[PDB]
Write a protein that binds this ligand. Structure first.
Ligand code: ATP
Ligand code: ATP
Ligand code: MG
Ligand code: MG
Lengths: 494, 463
């Protein structure tokens, strides 16, 4: 009875190439991972410095700087973060499948309420996609400066620093590919930062310090690169629901969705228990234009994890009848993918679907009392409610209350079916409805002309989806629907 | 500034914590990877027979079998593939990022016809989405039968198997989670096999327990029956395009879908060279009535990279306006993502899209031979053609003359702009076609999107 047991191994030589060319679709990944790492270092400084402001040595300010070099191709990434030590560069940055989060929580094992993103420890290797050679200038507030460099792809180098010191922070020096030199463009850096690291939580100054060349002499021409409040955007999303202002998160959503106007409704809440998360869920003021292009990339719900952008494929996060929601969920326990792009535990995905649709319908109920807003919401996204009515059976009744329709005395204002419930007559044992293209054509139709003689009211609901749904609601409010095809020319009696 | 160099360092603990929870989208993908691997082994032995049929004596019918068991909560998958060598076992299943498929594909180049699906070596690890304990048995044509037993908990144990005699191939025994027993259903297995492996290239037999009369007191019959109801769609794009007849036509269309109706168009082709991909295209005789029902994912073209379904997302592989053509694309050189769910090298996808657009023009001209058939074509799927007119600019001028039109004057005969251009009228100033939701010689445009069509077709070839 031979028994052989072997530990799990890894063929690394294939593995770095696998990660670089298969884990991450775009070369844009070179920047988001390192910027999030700088954010984590800055939060580390904050947590270690509010306990002892003595560690706030030299420059008290915390920031991130991007310093490209068109002449050289060197991509210098200066930050004022925690820096690196020997142990850091060896284990947290220089080892695959290991991150500084594990060691940091192993040091602070009690009350370490820090939701930092540096958990995977493999996003650092995503730099190869733009840079052939990568270098790191890092200096702790306590440890000396050290140089981490790698270009071989199979071996990396570390040398002691003796020249220009940093004091506080890390200066990541890359070398953007000569063919990929478009990444050296300041505009390209700004755009990739906005799309990947928009809400980091610190001013990424982007302040390229000019390589001054003294002295016929030339005047100053590259006076300053754009240090706009786009990369350098400060954190204002950190406010809880108590001090959140409407216009601030309106501008936050404008930035997130590249929009110009605010959002028509806000919903911030913290669902706890087995699943804990905050959810900055809003609604677009206007419908997305992908109604015709149903196969368009639907990037409406931009889920975040620890203030880091993760999700764009909103199709699997929510049932398609609530895929028009634009907002951010900022969780702290959601199991992501290795590429930080899509959510894997699909039982948890279904749980999230149920909770989010419940919250969205509850908000719509809060949006119900104010008539104009809910009328606008009906005009913009009432169709998804119809589809959920048509095939999502569990929340049909909940959706049904949300439904608004036009009736006889209602004129041309869509009122609830519960308004019809509010005005049935005792003789009526089944609710009168009718389907058609227009209200008036069926209003004068003989189907309800026998009904019109008494001044009765009949539901007038008119769309092809309205024609198909009537099959699914067999009976509403405990009473069957009245139609010349549902019941014929039959006269019920008491 | 002294210099120090690193060695290999990859934390095993977080590795498959990420693999189990941060690799694959849906839990049911576990069987798709298993069937893909079994079919890759089957294609390996098919190539081996093509160069040496003698060794195929260990089994003739290249098929796969599925045995659900709600009683034991176990999933059994037995195939007749190339099997496993213990060294291959360790180096590929027991070692991440090592694929025998990639090595075999790069070992030989003359046999470009063969399909080697899979490139990394981690798809087998998707089995831990639902299986608490995974037990994989296999017997290579050369190596003995060694089973694979591990729970992805930092180690794996293998030894010689002495259980059920695997005559030839692999054998995957699963012990799925108790809360996921819904995946042991016969109907669910049918659904996922038809969605993922209906054109796998080999028989898939799904055995089921059948009713027996119980004492009956006279003759108690057998217990079970074996249903090869799956993959009734035999692989025809592998075969030549000449030997396709209306009976194979109808069988392929009716088993590819579940529709009782029949095809309207066939376009079988295979483009080889720098971009090797085959494709079989089949068009319904009617526009589907569930077109406005998004609960049916818009997955008309199932990209079967190397005869295995990879993912039916039509965001890059085929444009939106080709959402009506339900068919199979058999590529051979695609750079799959780590989970076999998305793709990275988008230039290959773009050139494949353009090639498929040209092939769809060829299909339109193929139906252009039969005026009545092409008339039914256009009056059924006019929406997709006009959507393509709006969307694609590369072939915007090419698609114009391939269109048929029922007009206020042509009656029940569909008129073509190609013929209409051939009799171009000098007095004519604009092409006669007016946007509408539904219905000189003036064409009624069947789509509301046709306002964008008149935006696009301002003039075609001087019209
Ligand atoms: N400012 C920083 N710059 C670079 N690396 C940092 C910084 N702060 C911390 N690190 C370390 O970088 C190593 C991690 O890598 P990667 O760049 O792989 O990040 P992650 O852990 O994968 O997540 P993210 O990329 O979101 O930070 C971690 O182990 C973390 O300790
Ligand atoms: N049933 C099988 N038949 C034949 N070979 C198999 C089987 N299962 C695993 N293998 C081999 O072991 C290696 C395992 O693959 P896995 O299925 O683990 O990844 P892949 O097939 O390499 O690609 P991917 O990661 O995209 O699925 C495969 O590459 C294949 O060579
Ligand atoms: Mg990082
Ligand atoms: Mg595989």
């Amino acid at each position: 009875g031979e028994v052989e047991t072997f530990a799990f191994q890894a063929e690394i030589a294939q593995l770095m190439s696998l990660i670089i060319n298969t884990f991450y679709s775009n070369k844009e990944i070179f920047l988001r991972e390192l910027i999030s790492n700088s954010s984590d270092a800055l939060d580390k400084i904050r947590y270690e410095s509010l306990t002892d402001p003595s560690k706030l040595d030299s420059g008290k300010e915390l920031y991130i700087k991007i310093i490209p070099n068109k002449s050289e191709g060197t991509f210098t990434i200066i930050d004022t973060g925690i820096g690196m030590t020997k142990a850091d560069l060896v284990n947290n940055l220089g080892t695959i499948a290991k991150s500084g989060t594990k060691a940091f929580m192993e040091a602070l094992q009690a009350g370490a309420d820090i939701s930092m993103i540096g958990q995977f420890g493999v996003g650092f290797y995503s730099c190869y996609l733009v840079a052939d050679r990568v270098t790191v200038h890092s200096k702790h507030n306590d440890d000396e400066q050290y140089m981490w460099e790698s270009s071989a792809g199979g071996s990396f180098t570390v040398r002691t620093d003796h020249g220009e010191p940093l004091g506080r922070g890390t200066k990541i020096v890359l070398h953007i590919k000569e063919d990929l030199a478009e990444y050296l463009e300041v505009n390209k850096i700004k755009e990739i930062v906005k799309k990947h690291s928009q809400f980091i939580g610190y001013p990424i100054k982007l302040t390229v310090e000019k390589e001054r060349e003294k002295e016929k002499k030339k005047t100053i021409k590259e006076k300053y690169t754009e240090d706009e409040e786009l990369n350098k955007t400060k954190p204002i999303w950190t406010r809880n629901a108590d001090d959140i202002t409407q216009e601030e998160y309106g501008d936050f959503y404008k930035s997130l969705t590249n929009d110009w106007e605010d959002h028509l409704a806000v919903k911030h809440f913290s669902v706890e228990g087995q699943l804990e998360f905050r959810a900055l869920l809003f609604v677009p003021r206007r419908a997305p234009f992908d109604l015709f292009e149903n196969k368009k990339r639907k990037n409406n719900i931009k889920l975040y994890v620890r203030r880091v952008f993760i999700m764009d494929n909103c199709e699997d996060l929510i049932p398609e009848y609530l895929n028009f929601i634009k907002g951010v969920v900022d969780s702290e326990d959601l199991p992501l993918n290795i590429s930080r792009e899509m959510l894997q535990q699909n039982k948890i995905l279904k749980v999230i679907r149920k909770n989010l649709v419940k919250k969205c319908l509850e908000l719509f109920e809060e949006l119900a009392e104010d008539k104009e807003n809910y009328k606008k919401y009906y005009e913009q996204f009432s169709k998804n409610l119809k589809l959920g009515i048509h095939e999502d059976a569990q929340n049909r009744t909940k959706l049904a209350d949300l439904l608004r329709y036009h009736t006889s005395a209602s004129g041309d204002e869509a009122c609830s079916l519960k308004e019809y419930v509010s005005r049935m007559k005792e003789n009526q044992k089944h609710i009168y409805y009718i389907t058609g293209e227009n209200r008036d054509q069926v209003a004068n139709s003989s189907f309800v002309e026998r009904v019109k003689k008494r001044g009765y009211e009949v539901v007038y609901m008119t769309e092809p989806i309205d024609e198909y749904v009537v099959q699914q609601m067999r009976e509403y409010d405990g009473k069957t629907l009245v139609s010349v095809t549902k019941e014929g020319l039959e006269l019920p009696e008491d």
